[PDB]
Design a protein around this ligand. Sequence first.
Ligand SMILES: Cc1cc2nc3c(=O)[nH]c(=O)nc-3n(C[C@H](O)[C@H](O)[C@H](O)COP(=O)(O)OP(=O)(O)OC[C@H]3O[C@@H](n4cnc5c(N)ncnc54)[C@H](O)[C@@H]3O)c2cc1C
Length: 453
Amino acid sequence: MNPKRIRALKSGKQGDGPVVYWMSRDQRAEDNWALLFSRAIAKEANVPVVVVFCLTDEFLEAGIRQYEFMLKGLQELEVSLSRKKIPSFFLRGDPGEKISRFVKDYNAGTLVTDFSPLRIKNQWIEKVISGISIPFFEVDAHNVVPCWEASQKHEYAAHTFRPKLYALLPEFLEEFPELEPNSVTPEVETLSDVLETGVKALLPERALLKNKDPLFEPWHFEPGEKAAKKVMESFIADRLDSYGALRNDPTKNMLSNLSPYLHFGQISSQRVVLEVEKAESNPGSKKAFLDEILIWKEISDNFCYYNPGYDGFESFPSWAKESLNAHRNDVRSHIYTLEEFEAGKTHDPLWNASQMELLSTGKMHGYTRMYWAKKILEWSESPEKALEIAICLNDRYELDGRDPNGYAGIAWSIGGVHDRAWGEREVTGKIRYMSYEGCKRKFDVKLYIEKYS
Ligand SMILES: Cc1cc2nc3c(=O)[nH]c(=O)nc-3n(C[C@H](O)[C@H](O)[C@H](O)COP(=O)(O)OP(=O)(O)OC[C@H]3O[C@@H](n4cnc5c(N)ncnc54)[C@H](O)[C@@H]3O)c2cc1C
């Protein structure tokens, strides 16, 4: 077990009660460094390990599509942890109040959590630190190389982060040890009731078309750790050979479709990398997939960890801020409101089709995301307004939303983060421009519009 994966958040006197794993980002029982580190310390202190998940008050800022995907995976995880003699406690409310009260009520000895560089997680860390007196650790279980170890600063381009991450791969890309069960079973409601009351509270804000029927189709991605692995096996067996060639064709389903499982932590990226590396296929297709799940996935965590305002105009590069400012007064061709974007009521049928895939499936194709976001910038009153519209529609309807990949992806599309300066245009400046005719020369746009009416 590598000590560079765990970080100390607060020193304190260890209690003689169970080590608590405050699970948040990585919702799985297998291939979880944070859960394995909790079981090791619990073994050394000769005391069982317990798992606590907090159902926050912010679930109403999303939709039913994310509430059911996360909770149905939690029902499966509870059985898996119980088979390992590990009990799960699901609290509801502010984790600054619930975790602090649980630690004192159960005589907790050590508190451990998983790593997330998002602002809402740092808000929870500051609240729980002020209300505990036991040691508090955090473990990077989402990235192969720990986020604080891959780079000590913000990396402005992928060609700089790539050699730093690959040079550390032999040290941090390793097999997972088996989760040892609790020796004996130790000493706050049913998730089915929590999922019933939450969905009832989310029903008025459900996405519907004119016929009152729902828009979201929940049969595209079954949630759970078991379904997460089955999707990864299908990608390696059927789709990985053609990934490098058909990853930029929205009309082909050649992607791995692992993002909803990777967001909620139902499958480990290090596990996906291990199976892909030991699989035999096209080396151009392998290189392309590892570049997405290693370089671009972990540079998104690097962008959120080293830029406090990762969701603001101030985190853009200087060349992009100066360029967008010099075109702030350019007469926009069109200006749509948030409601026109949300309903896909723009003049562009390709953009509207890209939005309908987002509304109906909760997972828009990877290529159309850059078109969907860069057109928001072209048809917004300001770069800041486009940032708010893109983040709102991304986090509300993407099953992988509210994720560092989404903020770094939106920053790349609108602010040129991890990009370079292109030909100067009006309105958009030097930001990389993607036209409607450029998509037609790349893939059958008519087949993609006809699919998402
Ligand atoms: C405007 C915009 C919005 C995005 N919104 C999200 C989002 O809300 N949530 C999210 O997790 N990703 C987002 N992405 C990144 C990317 O689109 C998705 O990761 C990818 O489409 C997920 O589907 P997939 O797993 O089938 O793709 P694959 O090609 O099979 O890639 C597999 C994994 O590699 C990672 N990956 C792939 N592409 C990217 C990328 N461009 N940036 C970062 N990581 C990547 C992802 O973890 C992905 O799950 C966004 C990108 C853009 C440009």
